[PDB]
């Protein structure tokens, strides 16, 4: 199953983020929904989040899994992280390959509040 | 026959023989022979002790033995001026300490199990004890 | 594709209560058609095998390549990285295109057509379904009188039993056991 | 006695050489490698066994 293959692509990146500290952006996807959440340097708390499951984000879309839906989460999480003063961070991609929908989220954040 | 598969590490060293053994209650039959002393047994000595029991009961019982050798002995034909290397292996040995059960039987009466285990006592380094199933 | 959707539209789904299944997700499907070629131990001239691989690439939408053995120590006293076959396997749009000329007709060349066994076991419902020998297709530079050739046809399925594979196989031109 | 010891020279020109070993018994092909030197400050491929 793809989840059991995805953790095999994430455990080294996560063990190395455990050396870097600070907040993680936790960018995650499924074929129907896109997600991001700012989690603390200890994992005990989440500061702010964004996803294509939110009432107003989900209706202002043609499909909640599209590149435009990943960009909508990028603009939301960057606005919400800029409200919390977040800057000078790295990109955590939850075991996913960065091309396509994960990059469309990263470019939407660029002029919205977050650059890597 | 009465040796483990060969290894490149066959020149095993003597340890230090000590007390306590976990295996003490019969598990193959209703009558058995227990060490109640400490020492060592050779791969020919255990078969000579089995043969004395075999000749006492013949067909009237099957014999079990909990013992198969775990170390060789390194040995040389005569004393030497010291010295070089470590000698070659010549015979195999098993270690015994007091709580250990050694042999078991079931198909015989108790008075014949006592006789068969008496007929081996002069081939052994320790003064053994008779064991029964003893269930309430 | 000419014929393809039929194999998930109604195939076995019309009979799934003979198996007391309730969801169409409990019903078998085809995954792929593997193919395997008889290599004839050839090594010293090896160009007739490259031309038989060009005739395998004439019936498969794949690039012709080589397969390895899994063992590097074996009772066959094998060498390292040993080339053992070719596959040239069909899935999706290339499998539905292969169904237009293969596994559908063999009578344009005959001698008896009643002989040969037509059996398989797997316990999970995967099959060996080839009916043997070729009719040869009209092409160019194909007058080489090439000898000792074989192509074995196996199917991979989503089935859960030996009889579910035998029920799915009915959707193809296969003669079955007497 | 089975390997050669060669003198490779910079594609930017050097009186000096880069010192390394090479095959002489089963490979006729050449050895070429990028290296730095503070007289040209460019990091350049060293080539041909002089």
């Amino acid at each position: 199953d793809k989840k059991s293959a995805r953790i095999r692509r994430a455990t080294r990146a996560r063990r190395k983020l455990q050396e870097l500290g600070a907040t993680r952006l936790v960018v995650h996807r499924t074929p129907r929904h896109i997600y991001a959440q700012v989690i603390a340097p200890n994992g005990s708390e989440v500061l702010v989040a964004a996803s294509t499951v939110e009432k107003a984000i989900a209706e202002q879309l043609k499909y909640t899994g599209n590149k435009d839906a990943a960009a909508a989460v990028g603009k939301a999480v960057a606005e919400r992280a800029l409200e919390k003063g977040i800057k000078d961070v790295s990109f955590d991609r939850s075991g996913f390959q960065y091309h396509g929908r994960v990059q469309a989220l990263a470019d939407a954040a660029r002029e919205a509040g977050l650059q890597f | 026959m009465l040796q483990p598969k060969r290894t490149k590490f066959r020149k095993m060293h003597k340890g230090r023989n000590r007390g306590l053994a976990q295996g003490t209650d019969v598990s193959f039959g209703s009558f058995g022979l227990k060490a109640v002393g400490r020492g060592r047994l050779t791969a020919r000595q255990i078969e000579a002790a089995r043969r004395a029991m075999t000749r006492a009961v013949k067909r009237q019982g099957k014999i079990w033995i909990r013992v198969f050798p775990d170390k060789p002995i390194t040995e040389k034909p005569l004393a030497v001026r010291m010295g070089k290397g470590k000698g070659n292996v010549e015979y195999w040995v098993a270690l015994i300490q007091p709580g250990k059960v050694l042999y078991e039987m079931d198909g015989v009466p108790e008075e014949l199990a006592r006789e068969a285990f008496k007929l081996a006592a002069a081939k052994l380094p320790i003064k053994t004890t008779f064991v029964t199933k003893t269930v309430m | 594709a000419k014929l393809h959707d039929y194999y998930k539209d109604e195939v076995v789904k019309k009979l799934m209560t003979e198996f007391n299944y309730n969801s169409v997700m409990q019903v078998p499907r085809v995954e792929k058609i593997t193919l395997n070629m008889g290599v004839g131990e050839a090594i010293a001239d090896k160009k007739l095998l490259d031309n038989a691989a060009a005739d395998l690439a004439a019936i498969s939408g794949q690039k012709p390549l080589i397969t390895k053995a899994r063992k590097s120590v074996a009772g066959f006293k094998i060498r390292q990285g040993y080339p053992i076959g070719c596959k040239v396997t069909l899935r999706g749009e290339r499998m539905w295109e292969f169904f237009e000329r293969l596994i559908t007709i063999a009578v344009p060349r005959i001698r008896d057509f009643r002989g040969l066994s037509a059996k398989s076991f797997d316990g999970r419902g995967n099959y060996s379904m080839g009916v043997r020998e070729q009719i040869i297709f009209p092409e160019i530079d194909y007058d080489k009188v090439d000898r000792v050739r074989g192509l074995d046809i196996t199917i991979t399925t989503t089935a859960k039993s030996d009889e579910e594979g035998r029920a799915l196989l009915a959707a193809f031109d296969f003669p079955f056991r007497k | 006695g089975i390997r050669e010891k060669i003198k490779l020279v910079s594609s930017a020109g050097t009186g000096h050489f880069y010192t390394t070993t090479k095959n002489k018994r089963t490979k006729p092909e050449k050895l070429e490698l990028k290296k730095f030197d503070p007289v040209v400050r460019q990091h350049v491929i060293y080539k041909e066994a002089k």
């Binding site: - | - | 060349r109 005959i110 001698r111 008896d112 057509f113 009643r114 002989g115 007058d143 | -």
Partner: protein, 113 residues
Amino acid sequence: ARIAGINIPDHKHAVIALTSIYGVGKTRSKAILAAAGIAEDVKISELSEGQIDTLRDEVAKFVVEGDLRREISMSIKRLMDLGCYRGLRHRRGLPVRGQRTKTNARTRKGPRK
């Protein structure tokens, strides 16, 4: 062009891929060439333009392979399905014609290395 064979004449006469096709022997393929208006003059290997059609109509008039012998799927039972000594020798590498085995034994059914 392919009408009955699987082979092509390169330097040999026009009887190649018209003879030995499992239905037409050396005497009958000669008669088919004459019936198609083809002559043996200058040892032809490549036919004239459209001349294959006049030849095709004659070789498709003869029976081949599974039509030359068209009941072998039924004639098999008296040979392989019941007890048959005429078959049992064949499946032991032996003939059934009254063979002088002290002369003809050769290699194909047992060496002779």
